[PDB]
């Protein structure tokens, strides 16, 4: 901590053993890839399967 007794300063912590974390996107998606030309293509979010 920059200033410990000071509650206005954040306290940075460093771990010994790494912690396993899993973050997933339980939505199987599709890309529309709509055409907003000329030459440009936007990727829209389709339906979730």
């Amino acid at each position: 901590s920059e200033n410990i007794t000071n509650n206005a300063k954040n306290i940075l912590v460093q771990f010994n053993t790494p912690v396993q974390i899993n973050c997933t996107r339980p939505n199987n998606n599709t890309r529309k890839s709509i055409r907003i030309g000329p030459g440009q293509a936007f990727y829209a979010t389709g339906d979730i399967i």
Binding site: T24, P26, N28, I49
Partner: protein
């Protein structure tokens, strides 16, 4: 959409029965439906065999 079954109509006992369906007008890749078989013994009721789909999840 048409389903055409094909394979041996006559098989000997204790052997391996193999049958193959040929789809027309639709894709097996499509995630809207499952694909499988349903067998109906002669003069009897409908029995479910099984179905599968490659459209998976994260695990």
């Amino acid at each position: 959409p048409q389903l055409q079954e094909s394979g041996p109509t006559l098989v000997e006992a204790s052997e391996t029965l193999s049958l193959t369906c040929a789809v027309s007008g639709d894709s097996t890749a499509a995630c809207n439906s499952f694909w499988g078989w349903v067998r109906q013994p002669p003069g009897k009721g409908l029995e479910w065999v099984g179905s599968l789909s490659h459209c998976a999840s994260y695990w």
